[PDB]
Amino acid sequence: MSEKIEGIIDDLLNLEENAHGIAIIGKDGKIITQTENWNISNDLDKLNEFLNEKLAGITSLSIQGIKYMIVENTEERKIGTNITGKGHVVICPIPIGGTGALITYVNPRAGPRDVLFNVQEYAKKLTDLI
């Protein structure tokens, strides 16, 4: 963790109104940082399993007791939506198809595709820092 990474996250949160939570997984599979409104620590093994699964598949992912149905899975972005109104999650691998990730909890009132432009770009900003 660094203040450079903290600066990037703060910039993303101020820029992207529908980013309601952030977590970063380092290239080693460990949590670098996360926003204080959630904790993904007890779900890290399942998150890493999903992040690193090769496609040619995992259909749901639970984070902190919220079940997300997987509606999109590429090397660039993986999207889960809770279907009881609890929100969405967007996982952007760092690098594309890699072992690090920028994870965004998405405002329940938004669609998860709404944050993609910003989160995919900010994932690329973290390439050399994680």
Going from N- to C-terminal start, the domains of the chain cover 1-130
Say what the resolution is, in angstroms. Answer: 1.6
The secondary structure of the chain as a DSSP string is --HHHHHHHHHHHHH-TTEEEEEEE-TTS-EEEE-TT---GGGHHHHHHHHHPPP----EEEETTEEEEEEEE-SS-EEEE-TTSS-EEEEEEESTTSSEEEEEEE-TTS-GGGGHHHHHHHHHHTTTT-
CA separation, residue 37 to residues 22, 60, 93, 105, 125 (Å): 9, 22, 22, 10, 23
Q: What technique was this entry resolved by?
A: X-ray
For residue 124, give both structure tokens.
């690329």
